[PDB]
Amino acid sequence: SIWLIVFGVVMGVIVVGIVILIFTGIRDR
Amino acid sequence: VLPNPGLDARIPSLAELETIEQEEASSRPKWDNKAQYMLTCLGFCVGLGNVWRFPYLCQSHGGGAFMIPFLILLVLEGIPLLYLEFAIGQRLRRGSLGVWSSIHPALKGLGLASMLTSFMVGLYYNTIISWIMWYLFNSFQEPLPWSDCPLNENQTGYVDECARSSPVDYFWYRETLNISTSISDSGSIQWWMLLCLACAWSVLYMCTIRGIETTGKAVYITSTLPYVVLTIFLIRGLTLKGATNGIVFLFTPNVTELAQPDTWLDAGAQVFFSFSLAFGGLISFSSYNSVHNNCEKDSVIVSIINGFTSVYVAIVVYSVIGFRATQRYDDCFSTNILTLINGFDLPEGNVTQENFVDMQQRCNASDPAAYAQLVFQTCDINAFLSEAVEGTGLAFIVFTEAITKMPLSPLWSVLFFIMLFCLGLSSMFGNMEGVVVPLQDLRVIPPKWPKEVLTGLICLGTFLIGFIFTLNSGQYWLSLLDSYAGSIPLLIIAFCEMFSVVYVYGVDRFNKDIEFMIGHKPNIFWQVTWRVVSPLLMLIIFLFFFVVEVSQELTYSIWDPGYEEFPKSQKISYPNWVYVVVVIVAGVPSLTIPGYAIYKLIRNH
Numbered sequence: 349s350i351w352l353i354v355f356g357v358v359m360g361v362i363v364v365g366i367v368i369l370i371f372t373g374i375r376d377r
Numbered sequence: 378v379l380p381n382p383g384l385d386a387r388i389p390s391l392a393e394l395e396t397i398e399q400e401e402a403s404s405r406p407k408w409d410n411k412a413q414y415m416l417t418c419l420g421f422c423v424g425l426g427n428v429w430r431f432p433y434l435c436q437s438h439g440g441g442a443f444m445i446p447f448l449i450l451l452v453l454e455g456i457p458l459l460y461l462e463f464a465i466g467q468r469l470r471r472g473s474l475g476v477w478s479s480i481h482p483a484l485k486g487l488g489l490a491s492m493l494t495s496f497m498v499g500l501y502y503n504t505i506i507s508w509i510m511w512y513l514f515n516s517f518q519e520p521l522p523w524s525d526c527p528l529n530e531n532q533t534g535y536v537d538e539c540a541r542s543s544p545v546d547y548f549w550y551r552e553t554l555n556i557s558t559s560i561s562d563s564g565s566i567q568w569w570m571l572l573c574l575a576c577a578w579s580v581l582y583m584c585t586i587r588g589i590e591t592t593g594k595a596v597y598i599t600s601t602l603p604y605v606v607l608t609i610f611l612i613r614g615l616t617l618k619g620a621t622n623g624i625v626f627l628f629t630p631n632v633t634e635l636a637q638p639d640t641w642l643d644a645g646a647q648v649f650f651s652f653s654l655a656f657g658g659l660i661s662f663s664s665y666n667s668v669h670n671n672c673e674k675d676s677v678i679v680s681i682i683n684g685f686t687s688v689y690v691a692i693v694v695y696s697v698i699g700f701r702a703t704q705r706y707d708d709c710f711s712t713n714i715l716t717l718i719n720g721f722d723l724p725e726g727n728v729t730q731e732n733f734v735d736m737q738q739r740c741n742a743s744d745p746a747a748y749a750q751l752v753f754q755t756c757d758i759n760a761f762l763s764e765a766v767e768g769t770g771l772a773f774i775v776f777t778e779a780i781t782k783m784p785l786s787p788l789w790s791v792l793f794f795i796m797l798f799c800l801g802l803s804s805m806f807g808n809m810e811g812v813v814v815p816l817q818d819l820r821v822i823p824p825k826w827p828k829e830v831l832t833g834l835i836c837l838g839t840f841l842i843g844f845i846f847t848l849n850s851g852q853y854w855l856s857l858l859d860s861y862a863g864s865i866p867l868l869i870i871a872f873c874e875m876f877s878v879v880y881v882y883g884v885d886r887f888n889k890d891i892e893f894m895i896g897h898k899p900n901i902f903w904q905v906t907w908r909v910v911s912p913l914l915m916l917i918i919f920l921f922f923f924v925v926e927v928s929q930e931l932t933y934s935i936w937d938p939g940y941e942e943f944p945k946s947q948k949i950s951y952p953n954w955v956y957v958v959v960v961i962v963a964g965v966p967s968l969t970i971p972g973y974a975i976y977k978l979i980r981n982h
């Protein structure tokens with residue numbers, strides 16, 4: 349499913365960004 | 378004017394304000410650039426709510442008929458309350474809950490309701506975002522998935538629904554919602570709707586991880602892109618066959634719709650959704666400005682932009698409504714022509730718009746018996762324009778269908794959903810601001826835990842609550858929050874916010890403290906609205922709600938494939954038990970303002 353693969357890619361990138369920001373917060377600590 | 382004891386030592390002073398910024402640079406988030414603040418307000422006030430509900434409200438009632446009352450109340454009722462929210466946030470240097478409790482402890486209920494209202498409107502919006510991004514995920518295929526139907530069981534025709542209804546109708550109601558027969562017939566958490574909802578909440582948490590030191594960076598792409606795509610849709614929409622027909626239809630407003638009470642009632646409620654007034658976000662966002670920021674200029678600029686964008690969006694929604702309507706009208710005629718050309722074996726091209734009706738009777742005279750055995754659809758174009766879209770139908774059916782007609786369908790589709798996603802995400806930033814901050818200021822979680830912990834708990838919380846809008850009946854469930862129930866509390870809060878800042882904190886104090894910040898004491902226009910005009914309109918219109926909207930049977934359009942006139946809205950009354958659900962979500966925040974006060978007046982004494 350093209351729609352499904354698009355969804356997958358988007359969610360992956362979003363969670364990667366979430367992790368990066370939680371780390372940015374850890375750096376700020 | 379009301380007998381307030383020892384208001385000072387409960388709020389900041391005017392001589393202390395000089396040390397609320399440089400002295401208190403930390404401990405409070407501060408806008409890095411006024412630009413970053415203006416984009417947030419622009420985003421928040423001109424996001425979903427100003428660009429989503431408005432066209433729907435205008436497509437309903439009358440086109441131009443509904444626009445007049447909205448622009449009357451936008452200044453006579455909205456500009457005052459927007460200036461009063463900005464100034465009081467900038468003066469008391471605290472969020473919604475804090476500001477109200479500072480004026481009076483009993484006013485805490487006002488902030489409590491504001492938090493609940495903000496929570497519920499985010500829960501509503503998020504779902505719309507989830508549907509938007511379902512549609513955005515499917516729009517990367519040359520032939521868009523809603524431009525055709527699945528082959529019959531024998532791969533012959535197509536699903537009776539898709540055949541009897543529209544391809545776009547079948548992609549919305551069956552392939553996206555898998556909608557059930559009734560609100561009573563609860564369905565299952567359609568796994569793909571749940572998956573898109575997770576994506577929505579996930580992106581929002583990522584953008585609001587760390588309060589305003591992560592959303593201000595987001596609003597650089599999230600409050601610009603939506604306005605650089607809505608001016609292209611305007612051009613595209615204007616460049617549509619029959620677009621100028623629907624545009625005129627919008628500016629042709631029967632005056633008898635302006636003399637109906639509900640029309641204006643749906644305008645006042647709409648003012649408080651256009652500007653996110655009584656969510657409490659704005660108070661918090663204005664509290665991170667410089668103490669010497671001109672908030673009168675900001676309120677007027679936001680209001681003008683917000684007013685002017687409402688009309689710019691109804692000119693883009695009508696261009697498309699007249700485009701589709703013109704196409705239907707043309708198809709109706711083509712079919713009519715074909716029918717008479719068939720049987721009579723008229724030469725192809727012989728009969729045309731120029732000579733339909735004269736060749737109807739002519740051919741009738743030639744052979745009446747045969748002419749008698751000839752169905753003939755009625756084509757009007759104005760009737761096609763008058764056709765009213767169903768809830769959420771305009772964006773996921775009307776616009777989607779028009780895009781399929783547009784060349785390079787996938788480019789536009791993608792752009793259309795990326796605009797609606799961005800101005801949704803923008804709107805959600807304020808909605809989340811107005812539930813995180815009150816929850817910090819209740820001191821409910823141990824303050825050792827970082828801000829990111831509390832922001833994820835509410836994201837997951839509202840995510841879990843949003844499973845109800847993922848069932849087969851979820852759409853019906855979502856259409857309950859489009860009832861008067863949603864506007865019931867907003868009107869109460871907005872009125873209480875005005876009454877508390879004028880007849881409790883004191884308008885005289887307010888006039889002085891405003892003079893201390895911007896430099897001048899507010900004009901007669903601001904005096905005449907805040908003191909009498911604004912409160913009266915708000916109060917009188919809530920009384921009207923009680924009389925019209927409130928005094929109406931709860932009914933909902935159901936999508937029954939197995940129903941006489943299947944491709945027609947089936948309006949039925951809600952089952953009695955859903956009055957319970959409207960009593961809580963109209964009555965929890967609305968009775969919170971009185972019912973926390975009474976708590977504080979029976980514990981003290």
Ligand SMILES: CN(C)C(=O)CNC(=O)/C=C/c1ccc(C(F)(F)F)cc1
Pocket residue numbers: 428429430431432433434607610690691693694767768769770771772773776859
């Ligand atoms: C049911 N309900 C209460 C609603 O509020 C539904 N709103 C809608 O269906 C809104 C469509 C819409 C389509 C295009 C545009 C554009 F102009 F941006 F293209 C704006 C809004």
Ligand SMILES: *[C@@H]1O[C@H](CO)[C@@H](O)[C@H](O)[C@H]1NC(C)=O
Pocket residue numbers: 555557564849
């Ligand atoms: C949709 O709903 C029905 C039950 O309401 C279920 O049997 C079916 O598996 C679901 N999925 C569809 C129609 O794609």
